Amino acid sequence: SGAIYVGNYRVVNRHLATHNDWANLVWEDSSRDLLVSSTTAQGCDTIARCDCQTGVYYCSSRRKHYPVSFSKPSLIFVEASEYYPARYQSHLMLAVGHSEPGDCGGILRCQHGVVGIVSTGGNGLVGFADVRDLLWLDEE
Ligand SMILES: C[C@@H](Cc1cocn1)NC(=O)c1nn(C)c2ccccc12
Ligand SMILES: [Zn+2]
């Protein structure tokens, strides 16, 4: 589990969105595994607007942050899970790192801010849904 709280937005994995998220929906995209809802309170996370391809992510199944090198956002074929059939996921970045299904929502960041959230994984890989192209997260 996990979310990004920037401005009056909450960014979560689409497959983990709650009824309150769907009832206060701003934007969703199944191909990216992302959903954004509106919030009453202002958040403290800042979105990275950069070209970093090294950063750190939070792994809840280890209670630890790990440094990683990650690929550029791409269209990758992801295997079936209980939330999606096997399909192409867009704007996905892969790294070598431990992960388990419940680690989705953990933040990947660099010195510039939040880069994305954990969305896929297995066998020593972890995949992150990028958010750096969603420029509208920075404005009302
Ligand atoms: C919950 C789904 C979401 C999903 C996105 O694309 C299709 N399904 N993801 C997973 O199944 C999953 N995510 N991580 C971090 C893993 C690590 C090890 C094994 C499985 C996973
Ligand atoms: Zn950066």
Is residue 106 located within the same domain as residue 59? yes
Is residue 54 located within the same domain as residue 98? yes
Name the resolution in angstroms.
1.1
- How far is CA 90 from each of CA 31, 52, 123, rounded to the nearest angstrom? 6, 18, 21
How many C-beta atoms lie closer than 10 Å to residue 98's C-beta?
14
Assign residue 30 a region: left if phi > 0, alpha if psi is -120 to 50, beta otherwise?
Answer: alpha
Is residue 24 located within the same domain as residue 34? yes
Identify how the structure was determined.
X-ray
108 and 116 in contact (C-beta within 8 Å)? yes
Distance CA 140, CA 124 (A): 38
Is residue 71 located within the same domain as residue 8? no
Cα 139 to middle of ligand 1, angstroms: 30
The three-state DSSP-derived secondary structure of the chain is CCCEEEEEEEEEEHHHCCHHHHHCEEEEEHHHCEEEEEEEEEEECCECCCCCCEEEEEECCCCEEEEEEECCCEEEEECCCCCCCCEEEEEEEEEECCCCHHHCCCEEEECCEEEEEEEEEECCEEEEEECCCCHHHHCC
Known binder of ligand: residue 110? yes
Q: Which of 100, 120, 125, 126 is the best mutation target for the ligand 1 pocket, counting ligand atoms within 8 Å of the beta carbon and taking the most?
A: 120
Last residue of a domain, one of 28, 44, 60: 44
Active site residue 44: no
71 and 94 in contact (C-beta within 8 Å)? yes
Is residue 131 located within the same domain as residue 92? yes
> How many structural domains compose the chain?
2
Domain carrying residue 110: 45-140
